[PDB]
């Protein structure tokens, strides 16, 4: 009933970098976190990381449920040397959406998910800040990129900032993770034409004993 995360950072339990593969649905009243824990495999950070850690520390653990997004006209299998899982891989709970072919236009898409449970749903997504505009063009097509998240009486947009920051280890881009808590019976909507890392599953707090 008390769990030692080791190399897995607590927020990694939500998105699933390879160091967190054995914790994607953990159950624990006390969570032990370690200096060697990392939330990420590709360089980046969680928005409101401190607040979200607070929520998860007293959550009693997490149970994952499918969000049911399906796709066509794009690749859903973006991967990176940074996340090693028998070669290049990605976050286990997320899908790195790419245009069907290099430099091809990414289609404007909209995906929605309704929380049909009685508890609030924790929903994460990533925004990819490519290391270069050529990379962004290569991955999603050229032109302006925009991601919009909406829920009941709420809308917020994110515009990728393609630039080259210090490498980690060799990659100058960043994937930052954003989240929201979806009330029972509310619907989250994502509108995006690229630079969007999509959730495959939502997380529900288990509650303590």
């Amino acid at each position: 009933r008390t769990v030692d995360l080791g190399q897995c950072g607590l927020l990694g339990t939500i998105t699933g970098p390879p160091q967190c593969d054995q914790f994607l649905e953990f159950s624990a009243d006390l969570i032990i976190e370690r200096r060697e824990g990392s939330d990420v495999c590709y360089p980046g950070k969680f928005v409101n990381e401190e607040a979200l850690r607070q929520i998860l520390r007293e959550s009693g653990g997490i149970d994952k449920e499918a969000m049911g997004f399906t796709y066509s006209g794009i690749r859903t299998n973006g991967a990176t040397s940074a996340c090693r899982r028998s070669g290049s891989s990605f976050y286990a709970e997320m899908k790195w959406l790419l245009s069907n072919t290099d430099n091809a236009a990414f289609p404007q898409m909209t995906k929605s998910y309704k929380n049909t449970r009685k508890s609030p749903a924790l929903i994460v997504w990533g925004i990819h800040h490519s290391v270069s505009t050529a990379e962004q063009t290569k991955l999603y097509g050229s032109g302006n990129k925009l991601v919009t998240v909406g829920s009941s009486n709420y809308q917020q947009s994110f515009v990728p900032s393609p630039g080259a920051r210090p490498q980690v280890n060799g990659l100058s881009g960043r994937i930052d993770f954003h989240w929201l808590m979806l009330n029972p019976n509310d619907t989250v909507t994502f509108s995006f034409n690229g630079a969007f890392i999509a959730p495959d599953r939502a997380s529900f707090l288990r509650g303590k004993s």
């Epitope: 928005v47 409101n48 401190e50 929520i55 520390r57 925004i127 917020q156 900032s161 954003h178």
Partner: antibody, heavy 120, light 109 residues
């Protein structure tokens, strides 16, 4: 959603105060409650927040475990208790509704405020 | 550590009909996680803009928020008499929540 706070308080240095914030309307469990204070003539200062449906709170470190925020879902009431009061704690204390559960904390509706005067 | 917000100007003189511009600069990049409030003497602040450019329901359309990353602006087009007040930015990106020092918009004469 209306937020109605308890009345003004006068306290001596070193004592403590507990302010109440009662939410009318619907579904206390559908949002978080934050506490923000304002000293006379000064700007705004965030103290912390609570998510009632989870019972979890988040605090500003500057307050050094002097603050305790709690909530009672049966009465749709949140509380802020501030201990070891000092003169600099003299301020109007507000509660506010944060629909984002700390994901993008914003203060969508506010209480009327509670003056707390700390003095000998 | 904490995110510091620097608002400017601190005090502004304006007339009805003016276009008023208030800037907020954050000490690190915070994407679109910035809110704007209005406050008048003796009253709690009131939310105008959340998420840098989303208009709160019921707020007049002359209030426009812009910016992403570190530089943010609140633009009040066509300043109205009920707009003379103090304005605050607040970042929603990190703990602790922090505010700009405020901008007072007063009546020119």
């Amino acid at each position: 959603v209306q937020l109605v706070q308890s009345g003004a308080e006068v306290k001596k240095p070193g004592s403590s105060v507990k302010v109440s914030c009662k939410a009318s309307g619907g579904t206390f469990s559908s949002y978080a409650i934050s506490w923000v204070r304002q000293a006379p003539g000064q700007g705004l200062e965030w103290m912390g927040g609570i998510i009632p449906i989870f019972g979890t709170a988040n605090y500003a470190q500057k307050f050094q475990g002097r603050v305790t925020i709690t909530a009672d879902e049966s009465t749709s009431t949140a509380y802020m208790e501030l201990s070891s009061l000092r003169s600099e704690d003299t301020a109007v204390y507000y509660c506010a509704r944060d629909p984002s559960f700390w994901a993008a904390e914003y203060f969508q509706h506010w209480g009327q405020g509670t003056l707390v005067t700390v003095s000998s | 550590g904490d995110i510091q917000l620097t608002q400017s100007p601190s005090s502004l003189s304006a007339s009805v009909g003016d276009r008023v511009t208030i800037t907020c600069r954050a000490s690190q990049s915070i994407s679109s996680y910035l809110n704007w409030y209005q406050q008048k003497p003796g009253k709690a602040p009131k939310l105008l803009i959340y998420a840098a450019s989303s208009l709160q329901s019921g707020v007049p359309s002359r209030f426009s928020g812009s910016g992403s990353g570190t530089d943010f602006t609140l633009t009040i087009s066509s300043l109205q008499p009920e707009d003379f007040a103090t304005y605050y930015c607040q970042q929603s990106y990190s703990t602790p929540r922090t505010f700009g020092q405020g901008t007072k918009v007063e009546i020119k004469r």
